[PDB]
Amino acid sequence: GPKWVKTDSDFIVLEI
Amino acid sequence: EKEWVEQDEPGVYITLTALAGGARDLKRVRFSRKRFSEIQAEQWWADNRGRMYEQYNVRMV
């Protein structure tokens, strides 16, 4: 499934 | 396949590609940390994913 990536300081990313 | 970004709403940016002449392929959703906590971003996805599944092509697994 989609994964949350929280390592960037400008954006929260939901990576499909 | 070249990717581009669209603003779904302020602070919410979707990355898309062309696919089969129908719904565009969703690669990722980016939430501005100026506007979203991680909790709010997870709530946004819960509230909006149903619409996203119909407006875009979203690989489910």
Numbering used by the authors:
A (entry chain B): 272 to 287
B (entry chain A): 1006 to 1066
What's written in the study?
The RLD2 BRX domain adopts a compact α + β structure comprising an N-terminal three-stranded antiparallel β-sheet and C-terminal α1- and α2-helices. The LZY3 CCL peptide is folded into a β-hairpin structure and docks into the hydrophobic groove between the β3-strand and the α1-helix of the RLD2 BRX domain by forming an antiparallel intermolecular β–β association between the βB-strand of the CCL β-hairpin and the β3-strand of the BRX domain. The complex is also stabilized by polar interactions and the electrostatic surface potential of the BRX domain is complementary to charged residues of the CCL hairpin. At the interface, salt bridges between charged side chains from the CCL hairpin and the BRX domain are formed (Glu286-Arg1033 and Lys277-Glu1047), and the CCL hairpin loop is stabilized by Arg1038 from the BRX domain. Our mutational analysis suggests a dominant contribution of hydrophobic interactions to the complex formation and the importance of Arg1038-mediated stabilization of the hairpin loop. Using transient expression in protoplast cells, mutations at corresponding Phe1052 and Trp1066 of the RLD1 BRX domain or at Trp275 and Leu285 of LZY3 CCL were found to prevent the recruitment of RLD1 to the PM by LZY3.
Structural analysis of the complex of CCL domain of LZY and BRX domain of RLD, which are responsible for the direct interaction of these proteins, reveals hydrophobic and electrostatic interactions at the interface of the anti-parallel intermolecular β-sheet. We also demonstrated that the CCL domain of LZY and the BRX domain of RLD form a complex with high affinity in vitro and that they are necessary and sufficient for the recruitment of RLD from the cytosol to the PM. Our results prompted us to propose a model in which LZY3 recruits RLD1 to the PM of the columella cell in a polarized manner according to the direction of gravity following amyloplast sedimentation.
